[PDB]
Amino acid sequence: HYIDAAQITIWAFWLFFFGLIIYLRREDKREGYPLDSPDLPDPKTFVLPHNGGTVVAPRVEAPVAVNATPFSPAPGSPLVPNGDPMLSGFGPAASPDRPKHCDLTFEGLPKIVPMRVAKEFSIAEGDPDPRGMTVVGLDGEVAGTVSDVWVDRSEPQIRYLEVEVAANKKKVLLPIGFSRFDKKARKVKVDAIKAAHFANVPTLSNPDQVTLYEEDKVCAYYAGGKLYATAERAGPLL
Amino acid sequence: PEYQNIFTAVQVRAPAYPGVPLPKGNLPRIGRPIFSYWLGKIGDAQIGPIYLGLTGTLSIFFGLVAISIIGFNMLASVHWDVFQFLKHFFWLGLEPPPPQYGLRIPPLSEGGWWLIAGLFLTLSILLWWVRTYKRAEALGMSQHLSWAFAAAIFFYLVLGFIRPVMMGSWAKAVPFGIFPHLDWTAAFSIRYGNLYYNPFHMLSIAFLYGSALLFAMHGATILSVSRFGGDREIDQITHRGTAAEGAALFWRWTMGFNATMESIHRWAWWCAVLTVITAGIGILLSGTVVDNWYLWAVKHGMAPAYPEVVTAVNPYET
Amino acid sequence: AMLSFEKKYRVRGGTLIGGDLFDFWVGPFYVGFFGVVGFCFTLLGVLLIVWGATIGPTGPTSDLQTYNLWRISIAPPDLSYGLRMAPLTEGGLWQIITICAAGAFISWALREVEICRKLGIGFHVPFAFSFAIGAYLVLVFVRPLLMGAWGHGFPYGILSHLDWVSNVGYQFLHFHYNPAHMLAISFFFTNCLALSMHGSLILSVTNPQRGEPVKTSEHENTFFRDIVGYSIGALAIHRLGLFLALSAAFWSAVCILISGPFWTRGWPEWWNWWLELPLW
Amino acid sequence: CEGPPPGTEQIGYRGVGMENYYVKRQRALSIQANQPVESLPAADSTGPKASEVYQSVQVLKDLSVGEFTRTMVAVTTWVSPKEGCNYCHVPGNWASDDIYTKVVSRRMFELVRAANSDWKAHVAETGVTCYTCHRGNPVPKYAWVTDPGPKYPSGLKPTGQNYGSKTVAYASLPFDPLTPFLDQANEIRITGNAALAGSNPASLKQAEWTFGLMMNISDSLGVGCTSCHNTRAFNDWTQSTPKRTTAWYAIRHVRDINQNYIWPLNDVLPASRKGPYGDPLRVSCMTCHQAVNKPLYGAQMAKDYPGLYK
């Protein structure tokens, strides 16, 4: 027809494009599908190293009840957390149940471990040793002090700070991402939670390591405080 | 207030990392690590072990040759005065064979030099490719990189080698120079009736703009979920965490859909690769299939029309 | 409908303004006060773009009127109007639609803020997004201000705006010579490279050669150290990519910003300062 | 690089992007730098014609003595006010053509006369005068010559002019932005009139030459490509501005000036007026316009001297 080659080349592309999106929208569904009342792609298997295991995606995961109740029966309505908001494990305090194994270095040793275990590690020349500083919650009260430092042995860095809580002398983790330093005073400010809240931070089923399961529970705890650490945070700003 | 995860406030050291052990037939790993408190402020401070086999070395050499052929020429064009060479460097360049030659091989001083800088450059490029291919198998990994690089080469090759040859004229290739290669860019569009109306030029922009939209999206996202250790994209793909969850939901709630920790990197890979592919296709058809893109767009009812507030009598029409 | 792990996060509260009033979802989208204001700006925005197509550049009966998607165009007012409001059919429409686009875009960002507050995650995304809104604002608001007229803004048409870019650049004879422009392009290019590099790396480890098991972070770095003797690491590469992309938007914003308001001559001429150095 | 607010002018339809920007500060200084020298009082226009009282008057023939003298008084200040009458004359022998500056001047009365009477499609009723290019100087500040910058040009060059008459002289010149288009007459057009390919041989090199030439023209007139084009279609005359038409006739006008007015005088001009290649200082757009869309902001000087018309 009055059809030119530039035309037919644009058709081919778009044909490959549409086909592409489809492939991509199928991979977008290797997690979280089928939805809660592009098709699903046949499972793909990941072969974990060392001891290992085997993950498939998409997989069928058993539902886990929600620790909250519909603020309203209308669909699309939010839910209120049950009990003491920070205890809930709902909303910003939520988290899934990741494996109860530890992430491993290439050799296969608990990757994330404290400086009292990765013998080698060491603070950096011009940088304060966090060890021994005072942790202060969102309002100011002291919380405890840094009893140690957990690090990644694969990609050398501080992932967590160990925290000996005063109020109970228990050791809890604090992700670096939630900790701001104030070197010129040697403090480790913490907007996440209040001094008191440090008492309920999930604890380690071994003081020489943390599991994927345990990492989430920790961060999630602190995160919850971002909306549940105050009765005004949780509310508007208007 | 809140740490933004932009600058590591406290770094830590451990013996440098020599890397994973390579298999059967991989020379030692030259160079010995060093650190730099400052690189560390924004990233892994280890500056370390480089691998150099036949390939990679054979690539730097040829690669420096072409760069060398280009420079002396630039030195030659300004009469060999290194003062003048330095002063006008931006405007210097080594142009491709003139049209008179078609695809004949001309004397060095009449384009043969361009072909030699082209020959060796490509050679060094096609060699770094192989380099990046070896290095990824020795580690059991896949060839996603070498296949993306192969994508950028295709555009490069199309510019200076494929299109000229199909068109039977080295003079259609790109000149080696900073400002000169810029002038070529503008003239090329002028010569072919405005490249804005080239459909594949439009697609490549969308893909170039989108690659900026995407990286900004993925990067800001992964940082915003770093508190939950979202950067460890490796285990979140195998063992989905609240990071991959807070992430996917930020998007589902924003734009109605979302990806996965793994799949987002496929949207990214593909969005980048299609930038150079639609580009070469775009240049491939230029002059070869279409001669005036604006007109083509008119033939396809795509060009906007405006009230004629300004017009000029055509003198050619006495 | 929700993902199979989404309910545990659909908490109540986290708003900025409004509280329980609009704190709900519709399908997968979270609404919020900013979902309502945003939708209002968009709708009047779109509905106005529709009536404009209806009227055409001359009249609803004109031969220039069109409903073809490539040719529809809503253009700014003449420059003769300066910073004044222009008659609807003489650039008025464009003036209103712009306010809506800005209101629509700013709400979207503000809506990402509430969504972030609800998840206890950082606000990097809406921070980064405001860079695209700034670029848009510089093109449609700031620049036209420094120049003294709204007509300096680009028109709203799929291809007509490409006609604008073309004619604004060539006003400078050779726009490629804009130094800020050269910077932005380098960023756009470098980003596209990094993005492809990041993409490739992850999928290469989470999916290696057959037989092999999922790779590790050490591999990532061992490869990137192998190829170019350095690896910036997981965290930082996401840090880098965001830098490049935001920078692309920034230098794009200044490149046009300096073109007209602070530099009126051709662009190749700017480079004279280099041919006049005393070094020579 | 300072500014706010810049001067601006709308050229095309709103939204199309065809507008012009400039520094007011410098536009005012420029206006001050391009002032025309005021005219001389009218001349008693009675009596015999110059050609009746003089012996070697081959051009300003039909002018009255008074107007003739006046024309001489004006042309002096316009070309060589510091040298006076004696610049183009042999003392004691006003009629002798025994000095190159008289043979050239005579020829330059014909260049102007021609400009004003035959090239109105370009110069309209504004016209030109000696002052236009000279600005009180014996050697026009903006006359040009094919000079070798410190860099080597592309050995390639538009194919001469597509001719072989008095062209052996152009063969000794390397490539230069202007000569091949505003002296010789090679093809500037490269854009095709058909969408599909297989029928347009213009080269990319040709594209660059036309782009180059155009950058010169713009700079010479102190404008941007939108003063004449709609860059979405450079070749489209219906989408262009009436200045493009005018610039077209200007390109020919300048070709006629250089070819039949400057080059022929090449044998009677001293070496000091020729470039390293032996070519003479000739005319380009800069020569008259000197960075303004209209020489001396379009001041109308010529209308006062009838001696400058055929």
Ligand code: BCL
């Ligand atoms: C006035 C001129 C024209 C114009 C002319 C062109 C031309 C001509 C081309 C483009 C092309 C592109 N343009 Mg443009 N373009 C214009 C206006 C625009 C605008 C705009 C906002 O106005 C945008 C954003 C675009 C956008 C783009 C890109 C999408 C695209 C380039 C892809 C790329 O990744 O390059 C960067 C990528 C590469 C070059 C790959 C590099 C690969 C190799 C392997 C690396 C080698 C390095 C080497 C070893 C180093 C050593 C060298 C020695 C030192 C010597 N253009 C106007 C309309 N456009 C390209 C296209 O797609 O056209 C169809 C193209 O060819």
Ligand code: BCL
């Ligand atoms: C012939 C003219 C010139 C020229 C003229 C111009 C001019 C003039 C301009 C540029 C600008 C740009 N050019 Mg150019 N340019 C040329 C050649 C090039 C080449 C090339 C390969 O030759 C390149 C790569 C570039 C590169 C670039 C970029 C640096 C820059 C545009 C990016 C941007 O602004 O993002 C910034 C991003 C945005 C503005 C987008 C904001 C998006 C918003 C707010 C949200 C949108 C939502 C939407 C409405 C909803 C849709 C969703 C659906 C509902 C589902 N140009 C030629 C030489 N260049 C422009 C610039 O720098 O602008 C700042 C500019 O104005």
Ligand SMILES: CC[C@H]1c2cc3[nH]c4c(c3C)C(=O)[C@H](C(=O)OC)c4c3nc(cc4[nH]c(cc(n2)[C@@H]1C)c(C(C)=O)c4C)[C@@H](C)[C@@H]3CCC(=O)OC/C=C(\C)CCC[C@H](C)CCC[C@H](C)CCCC(C)C
């Ligand atoms: C599709 C996505 C894009 C993309 C992708 C891409 N590029 C890539 C890759 C990928 C996936 C690689 O794997 C490869 C890479 O990064 O390898 C480590 C690369 C690469 N992309 C590069 C450049 C590049 N990519 C570009 C664009 C793009 N690349 C696209 C946007 C551009 C442009 C024009 O925008 C450029 C400039 C290189 C960094 C690299 C490939 C380099 C290469 O092949 O090696 C050739 C070798 C030599 C020339 C030797 C140089 C070695 C010398 C030691 C240094 C010389 C400098 C000298 C000191 C100056 C003075 C000279 C002396 C002699 C006096």
Ligand SMILES: CC[C@H]1c2cc3[nH]c4c(c3C)C(=O)[C@H](C(=O)OC)c4c3nc(cc4[nH]c(cc(n2)[C@@H]1C)c(C(C)=O)c4C)[C@@H](C)[C@@H]3CCC(=O)OC/C=C(\C)CCC[C@H](C)CCC[C@H](C)CCCC(C)C
């Ligand atoms: C600085 C980084 C870059 C960037 C970042 C960025 N963009 C973003 C984000 C981020 C981080 C988001 O979070 C947000 C998003 O939700 O992405 C999925 C977004 C986004 N970037 C988008 C587009 C986009 N970004 C672009 C560029 C960039 N985005 C930069 C490169 C471009 C271009 C031109 O390069 C486009 C087109 C959207 C997908 C999305 C913004 C969604 C949104 O704001 O929705 C609200 C508004 C509407 C649904 C429509 C309103 C329409 C009107 C009221 C009238 C329209 C008038 C209009 C101005 C004229 C028509 C334009 C003509 C030119 C064609």
Ligand SMILES: CC(C)=CCC/C(C)=C/CC/C(C)=C/CC/C(C)=C\CC/C(C)=C/CC/C(C)=C/CC/C(C)=C/CC/C(C)=C/CC1=C(C)C(=O)c2ccccc2C1=O
């Ligand atoms: C009436 C109603 C529905 C109420 C809702 C409230 C609203 C939306 C108000 C605003 C107003 C109005 C009227 C809007 C209507 C619009 C509708 C129905 C939807 C919105 C439109 C919109 C902006 C669409 C954009 C679509 C595009 C092309 C986006 C470009 C980016 C792109 C190509 C993305 C594909 C890749 C993806 C999915 C990226 C997200 C993404 C990233 C970046 C990750 O890093 C990440 C990491 C780990 C897990 C997942 C992810 C992930 O999903």
Ligand SMILES: CCCCCCCCCCCCCCCC(=O)OC[C@H](COP(=O)(O)OCCN)OC(=O)CCCCCCCCCCCCCCC
């Ligand atoms: C005049 C032009 C205006 C339009 C502009 C077009 C821009 C692209 C489209 C924007 C998406 C709209 C709303 C999002 C989906 C939604 O809101 O609803 C949800 C549906 C249903 O997903 P699900 O039920 O399977 O699972 C529940 C999870 N959503 O999402 C999808 O299937 C995925 C859609 C992704 C497609 C993105 C690819 C864009 C193609 C580009 C088109 C041309 C541009 C040039 C680029 C090369």
Ligand SMILES: COC(C)(C)C/C=C/C(C)=C/C=C/C(C)=C/C=C/C(C)=C/C=C\C=C(C)\C=C\C=C(C)\C=C\C=C(C)\C=C\CC(C)(C)OC
């Ligand atoms: C004096 O100099 C010293 C000694 C100090 C050295 C320093 C050198 C310097 C300063 C160099 C500077 C170089 C610069 C600035 C280079 C810039 C280059 C740019 C901007 C290039 C841009 C684009 C180039 C392209 C697209 C070219 C592509 C060319 C290709 C693909 C050519 C391929 C050619 C082939 C395959 C030839 C095959 C040969 C045969 C004969 C087999 O073909 C039939």
Ligand code: HEM
């Ligand atoms: C100085 C004020 C001045 C005078 C006086 C003057 C006079 C003059 C006469 C009388 C003639 C006619 C000679 C004859 O008998 O043929 C004449 C002719 C020409 N002039 Fe003149 N002129 C004066 C100044 C100048 C200057 C500064 C120039 C050149 C820039 C100049 C040029 C000429 C030319 C040429 C002619 C020839 C006229 C013709 O052929 O029609 N003179 N001069």
Ligand code: HEM
């Ligand atoms: C005006 C009627 C006019 C006169 C008179 C005139 C005279 C003139 C002379 C005497 C020379 C020779 C100078 C020398 O010493 O070599 C000369 C040379 C050039 N001119 Fe002329 N000229 C008059 C008008 C114009 C106009 C309007 C232009 C521009 C289109 C023009 C251009 C030139 C050029 C070029 C030269 C050669 C350069 C040189 O020899 O100085 N003049 N002019």
Ligand code: HEM
């Ligand atoms: C701006 C720096 C500028 C450019 C670029 C430009 C380009 C251009 C092209 C590519 C052509 C050839 C079109 C074709 O192939 O048919 C062309 C031709 C003409 N132009 Fe030019 N032009 C730019 C600037 C200007 C300006 C400022 C003017 C006006 C003074 C102008 C004029 C013209 C004219 C006249 C032509 C026609 C030439 C002919 O027919 O021989 N341009 N321009």
Ligand code: HEM
């Ligand atoms: C050189 C090739 C050249 C070009 C191009 C050119 C263009 C040009 C235009 C577009 C105009 C009109 C500007 C407007 O309408 O705003 C114009 C006007 C005049 N020109 Fe010119 N011109 C070129 C060269 C020359 C040369 C060498 C001379 C000198 C003899 C000259 C002179 C003039 C004059 C006088 C005018 C004014 C006309 C008017 O409308 O008042 N030009 N030119």
Ligand SMILES: CCCCCCCCO[C@@H]1[C@@H](O)[C@H](O)[C@@H](CO)O[C@H]1O
């Ligand atoms: C009409 C043809 C549509 C083309 C389908 C586009 C999907 C391409 O997607 C490809 C797969 O096909 C490929 O096998 C994998 C493996 O890593 O890489 C993907 O990126």
Ligand SMILES: CCCCCCCCO[C@@H]1[C@@H](O)[C@H](O)[C@@H](CO)O[C@H]1O
């Ligand atoms: C990235 C967004 C670009 C959207 C592309 C717009 C294409 C418009 O689609 C056009 C219609 O508007 C037109 O009237 C018909 C019928 O001949 O042809 C279609 O291709």
Ligand SMILES: CCCCCCCCCCCC[N+](C)(C)[O-]
């Ligand atoms: C970006 C365009 C939107 C901004 C529009 C601004 C309009 C301001 C109108 C104030 C002047 C009033 N009036 C009556 C003279 O038009």
Ligand SMILES: [Fe+3]
């Ligand atoms: Fe990532």
